Ligand binder design. Structure first.
Ligand SMILES: NCCC[C@H](N)CC(=O)NCCC[C@H](N)CC(=O)NCCC[C@H](N)CC(=O)N[C@@H]1[C@H](O)[C@@H](OC(N)=O)[C@@H](CO)O[C@H]1NC1=N[C@@H]2C(=O)NC[C@@H](O)[C@H]2N1
Lengths: 144, 63, 200, 117
RNA sequence: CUCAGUAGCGGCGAGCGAACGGGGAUCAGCCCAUUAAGUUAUGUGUGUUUUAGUGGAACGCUCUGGGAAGUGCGAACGUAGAGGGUGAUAUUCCCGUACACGAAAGGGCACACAUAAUGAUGACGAGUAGGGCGAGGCACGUGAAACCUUGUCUGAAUAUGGGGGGACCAUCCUCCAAGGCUAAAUACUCCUGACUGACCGAUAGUGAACCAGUACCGUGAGGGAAAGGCGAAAAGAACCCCUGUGAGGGGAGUGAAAUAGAUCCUGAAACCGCAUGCAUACAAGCAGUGGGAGCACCUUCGUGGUGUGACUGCGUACCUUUUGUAUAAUGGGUCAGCGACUUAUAUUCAGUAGCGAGGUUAACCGUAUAGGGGAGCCGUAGAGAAAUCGAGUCUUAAUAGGGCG
RNA sequence: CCACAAGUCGAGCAGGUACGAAAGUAGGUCUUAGUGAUCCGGUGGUUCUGUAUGGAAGGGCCAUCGCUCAACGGAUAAAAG
């Protein structure tokens, strides 16, 4: 035990890799699992993803819809349970960013009722849902 | 390198909690001859079929 | 944990650093990762594009009776390119910080269990002479050993340089391969406490 | 880690050629020909391990027929008589007795006739 | 490094693909006519390095052997147990290694001072900004197309002035074009020195280990090989014999070994001889297989071993491609050597290990697999095109119904 | 009913309505053919978006228009020997 020639990996951790075209006995000899002839048996034989043989594809017989919002990329969602990562009792955008629950380029945040908290927090300038606000006050905290 | 999204499919599909949603065809034009029931039932989103979900996943690896 | 030195004195060390159960799979992963990271990986071969010459078609496609050929440097031909030419590779693997620390703790605990770790209150030599260190190790009955100190004294380093199966390291420089390879590990109390603070 | 194939390939070819000993011409000298000859020999042996039982039973039946006809019976009548007499001696032993001990086979034929009566 | 294959561009196809912000490396500004930082030459001084070199520890006996470094026994050195050689495998036989010294003379670099030059024909920027036409560049294909460049035609205001903030206007914010110089972090290897390799070992590795870009081919540009090994030491065989004073061999001699004798270590296969044993000149075919007499040698004397195989049942090769091949369908004259599912990145699933409502760092720093580095990423919430709400949300006049949860 | 994309029948609820004294009937025509995806644009609305801010341009959503794309799941806007 504890020698360079008495160390082994756990059972099932390692496997031999598959080696094609090395005889009848291996079970993957000759064609190597590619079948007989056709396009897929050639080198680089697959067709492009989304190609269906020539008929109009699924992503082209359906219409485009919607537009992309720019402020949604800067809006951040915060679970209520994540408030425990904040050091101190003040919950603001700056302290959430310091605790790393909000990305540094976000300009506003929202707190949703997802988990549970015990400490009392003071919330400054962060939007709260109805249930999140109720939980914040029930934990002995307040908003501004 | 990084897998690249097929932007045409990205413009057609969006992800739901357990799948993908999409709009319905045959509502762009030639609408006068269509019955009211077809007009109001082809409106809105539906789900992508399970037979097409795999292709959608290969085409849109990040959504 | 309470362990006695050679001179019978009692030292108290944390169970976290020196008392964790042995996890052979984790230790094996970390040891093999260290050995893989020791590789240099410098080599290359020439493919059919790198081999000298071979630009032109050796003979016409039809009519000669030969098998068709496109270049004299084809990998089928003698003297042609290697089919899958190699390039220099990096053999380093990522090891999780916690996994590395856990493997080191397991190794230290197993050494303590197997009695290959020897604690000493003080380990120093008065001169950079090989024979003095050899006599000290012989009376400690640790002729083949890795010595771990809080700081490596120059005289100790010079005395240990020429001894086979003997090495000397700082407390912050131990590695899982060297902890296992040597027959015994002679560790001073100061080095043991520094290792305890590092927590394996 | 370049691997040279010479030693192992030579061993395999030499083993095939050693199993091909005694064959005519290229079948005992040339590897491509010798390898086909060894496989076909194995196939023939597999088939003939079944054919041997049939051939030897046919030989036993022929010898028993000769003995029965010397004793005044046919093979089918003798077999039927022995079955009716409850004798369960098999054809291999019956043919051995027919070939090497005429008196015992005469006694067996008499028992078969007595049971047929 | 990330943001992010996101925002966008695109016969809205195939594909192309940012920026803002954040984390790092490195950090530096100085001037436009009495003219700056800086840079380059030359000369002097100091420091450092480089081009020859010197010394450099410690082993004996015994056995096998042609030969000892190997066996057995017992010693010595180690700031030297890197490496190479020596008749087989050496810390102590040799060259070296650690370490300690060393330069008439010449070269490189750094710093300081001194003298030139240069920066510097340039003094706040007019045929300029802007505009019409045609093109090019921007991730951006004329698009709602801002911004940069200009071939052509034009053309301001000039600090109460002018440029930008993606058509455009107003308001705010921000900067000062039409004059310049500037180290580091970055890119590379024809070369020089030292060190290294889960790189090759003569069909490999450079085309080339060898008198190789040679022989050879072509008018020419150009193309382009094959070919390493006697022995520790030539001790490379004096002399005799056959033969043509040839080649070649038999003796002798050397050597541990000459079937190590010169294209000489080992000496495989295809292919070609000689010798011995058995079979074979009345019998029709993938050549074997299951039986089976006789003969020869060996012998543990047989219910044994080796070689051969009269006679006999059955029996149309292999691969590929095909509905289907003995097929008169394809491929192979034979042997030996080489010859085809890889590597990098991203992603998904399974197994396994750590940690666990959390998990994990990237670049980078780091006498460097450690330890630091939390930017970022994934998970923890969904609905809606979106604004918005949120265990709900969308649709709707509807709290009805219904869809996603 | 169906590979997908599509196609077909539908009781019942709410609002407004027509014809009936009323119970009621009516979401085109006895039924099964009379048809064309996506892209790109046009038009009418809209409590959505709007690249510093207020607007606007442009985009989104709802309704609707333009193919003998008839080789009728339609490879180009654009092609004979
Ligand atoms: N019982 C029967 C008795 C019969 C009776 N006797 C009569 C009979 O019948 N007799 C037969 C005679 C046999 C045969 N005909 C004789 C024969 O052939 N002589 C040949 C004589 C000339 C020969 N060609 C010369 C030759 O080649 N030199 C080589 C050559 O330059 C070179 O090699 C390569 N690579 O090219 C080099 C490699 O470096 O080595 C050289 N050489 C070296 N040697 C040295 C060494 O050892 N150390 C140091 C260094 O000096 C080494 N270099």
């Amino acid at each position: 035990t504890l020698r360079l020639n008495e160390l082994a990996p756990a059972e099932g951790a390692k496997r031999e890799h598959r080696r094609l075209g090395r005889g009848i006995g291996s079970g993957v000899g000759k064609t190597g699992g590619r079948g007989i002839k056709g396009q897929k048996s050639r080198k680089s034989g697959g067709v492009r993803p989304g190609f269906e043989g020539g008929q109009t594809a699924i992503y082209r017989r359906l219409p485009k819809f919607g537009f992309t919002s720019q402020i949604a990329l800067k809006t951040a969602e915060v679970r209520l349970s994540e408030l425990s990562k904040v050091e101190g009792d003040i919950v603001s955008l700056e302290t959430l960013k310091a605790a790393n629950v909000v990305r540094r380029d976000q300009i506003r945040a929202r707190i949703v009722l997802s988990g549970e908290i015990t400490r009392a927090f003071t919330v400054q300038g962060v939007a709260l849902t109805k249930g999140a606000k109720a939980a914040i006050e029930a934990a002995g905290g307040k908003v501004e | 390198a990084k897998l690249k999204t097929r932007r045409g499919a990205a413009k057609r599909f969006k992800a739901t909690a357990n799948g993908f949603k999409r709009k319905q065809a045959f509502k762009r034009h030639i609408l006068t001859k269509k019955s009211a029931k077809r007009i109001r039932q082809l409106r809105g989103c539906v789900m992508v079929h399970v037979s097409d979900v795999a292709s959608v996943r290969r085409m849109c690896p990040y959504i | 944990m309470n362990l006695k030195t050679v001179s019978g004195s009692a030292v108290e060390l944390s169970e976290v650093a020196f008392g964790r159960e042995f996890n052979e799979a984790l230790v094996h992963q970390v040891v093999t990762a260290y050995l893989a990271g020791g590789r240099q990986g410098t080599r290359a071969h020439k493919s059919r594009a790198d081999v000298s010459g071979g630009g032109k078609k050796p003979f016409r496609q039809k009519g000669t009776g030969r098998a068709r050929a496109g270049s004299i440097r084809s990998p089928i031909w003698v003297g042609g390119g290697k089919t899958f030419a190699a390039r220099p590779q990096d053999w380093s693997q990522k090891v999780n910080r916690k996994m590395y620390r856990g493997a080191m703790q397991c190794i230290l605990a197993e050494l303590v269990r197997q009695d290959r770790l020897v604690l000493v209150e003080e380990f120093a030599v008065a001169a950079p002479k090989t024979k003095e260190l050899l006599a000290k190790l012989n009376d400690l009955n640790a002729a083949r050993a890795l010595i771990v100190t809080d700081a490596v004294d120059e005289n100790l380093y010079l005395a240990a340089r020429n001894l086979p199966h003997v090495d000397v390291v700082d407390a912050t420089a131990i590695d899982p391969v060297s902890l296992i390879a040597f027959d015994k590990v002679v560790m001073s109390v100061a080095a043991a406490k520094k290792i305890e603070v590092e927590l394996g | 880690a370049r691997v040279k194939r010479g030693v192992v390939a030579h061993r395999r070819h030499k083993k095939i050629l050693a199993r091909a000993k005694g064959y005519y011409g290229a079948r005992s000298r040339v590897y491509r020909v010798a390898f086909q000859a060894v496989i076909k020999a194995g196939q023939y042996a597999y088939r003939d391990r079944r054919q041997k039982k049939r051939q030897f039973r046919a030989l036993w039946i022929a010898r028993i027929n000769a003995g029965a006809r010397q004793n005044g019976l046919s093979y089918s009548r003798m077999i039927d008589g022995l079955k009716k007499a409850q004798v369960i001696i098999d054809r291999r032993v019956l043919a051995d007795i027919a070939m090497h001990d005429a008196v015992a086979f005469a006694a067996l034929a008499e028992k078969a006739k007595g049971a047929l009566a």
